[PDB]
Symmetry: C2
Subunit: 176 residues, 2 copies
């Protein structure tokens, strides 16, 4: 089973990251998870898990294997779901305030697939240019914009849509 | 009561445009509506209205008052909800295949507020640059990315969120 890196930042829509995490486990992926403090509060205002093969890394722990290119090059990809506008900026500018930012920088320099789920509205020029820079650098930017193709009925149907889009980015087969 | 221009293009999420239309009427706005053929099919695969003060214009009718700057300068703003990637491109490049594109060009040259609701995923560089050009030109780009701040329960709660964001762009008071 391959390795996947998943970072969850403090932005509205932390649920997308939870759902993505659950699916990766179900599909038998060894997940290395990074959860920001900002993300912890959000999932509440918006822990005990029976999930398998998940290794958690402290958002402040730069000794983490994920912070080493030599280690990261063996992963199938890196997800930052959801990716706050702040994290988007930090990665686009190479400013590293936490492990998550570092992992983005490592993915970029090691050319490891990097996927971001942005959830903001409206967009200002900075948001657009940061996403453009990520994109031009090989990264993939996915806005949390569910569609109505499949005639969704619940919020759950829209979450799965976005999660399915994220998995398709890395060609991971699924049934959502 | 002021005038509002609303264009609905063929893109997944035509529902956002329907909801926005209903709210504008309820808030007592004289709405000039343009509906693409592409949009008609979509709302089905995804007419008889008891709505008041709505004047409909043919997507191909360039004689429409909306195609005249002298007329458009008196509107509070122009909505293109939802705005397909094609329409986004046409307006950003000044290519006019239909009335809707023309109205975007008129709004831009007459500096009439222009608001677009984009629904696409993932974004490629073209999508980003088109949105950036619209933005730099004074237009406002709103991605159809509902948030979970208000703890939504139904798809309806997410539609209202996005619709509320669109109204806030033009400072129109509402209770959604």
């Amino acid at each position: 089973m391959q390795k996947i890196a998943l970072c969850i930042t403090g932005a509205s829509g932390v649920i997308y990251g939870i759902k993505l995490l659950q699916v990766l486990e179900e599909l038998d992926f060894s997940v290395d998870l990074v959860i920001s403090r900002n993300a912890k509060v959000v999932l509440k205002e918006e822990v005990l898990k029976g999930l398998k093969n998940v290794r958690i890394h402290e958002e402040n722990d730069f000794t983490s294997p994920l912070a080493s290119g030599s280690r990261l090059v063996h992963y199938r990809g890196v997800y930052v779901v959801p990716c706050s506008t702040n994290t988007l900026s930090c990665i686009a500018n190479g400013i590293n305030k936490n492990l998550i930012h570092r992992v983005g920088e490592v993915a970029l320099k090691e050319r490891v697939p990097l996927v971001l789920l942005v959830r903001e509205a409206p967009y200002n020029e900075i948001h657009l240019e940061n996403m453009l820079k990520i994109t031009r650098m090989g990264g993939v930017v996915v806005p949390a914009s569910p569609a109505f193709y499949h005639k969704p009925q619940s919020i759950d149907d829209m979450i799965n849509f976005v999660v399915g889009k994220l998995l398709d980015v890395l060609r991971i087969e699924h049934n959502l």
